[PDB]
RNA sequence: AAUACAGAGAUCAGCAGUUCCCCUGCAUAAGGAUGAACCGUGUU
């Protein structure tokens, strides 16, 4: 299926995104568009993989972002 | 008129062309017959 239908309805679950700066963030999906403009909830964000801080909501924009690890109960959930 | 002469003086065959008439083609005119499952006012 297609990438933005997968984040979709990936919302609720926990996932990790790369930035393009090497920053990571580890959040709970709580909103996508169809530009891949992400919020989430719950955040921590990295400088870099090598790791902090705690934030409540983040909005990432869509170009921004290298990768994003699923968690693997994706393919059911 | 007398004479000199020279003195009795081509055939077999083919094709097209006019004239009507039939067969078969193509053209030009008019005429008809029948067949063809589809419907134009923010990433390069």
Excluded: C, H
Excluded at 2 to 18: F, S
Aim: proline share 1%.
């Amino acid at each position: 299926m297609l990438p933005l239908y997968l984040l979709t309805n990936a919302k609720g679950q926990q996932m990790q995104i790369e930035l393009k700066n090497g920053e990571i963030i580890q959040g709970i999906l709580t909103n996508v568009d169809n530009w891949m403009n992400l919020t989430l909830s719950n955040v921590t964000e990295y400088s870099e993989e090598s790791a902090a801080v705690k934030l409540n909501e983040i909005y990432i924009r869509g170009t921004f972002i290298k990768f994003i690890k699923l968690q693997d109960n994706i393919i059911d959930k």
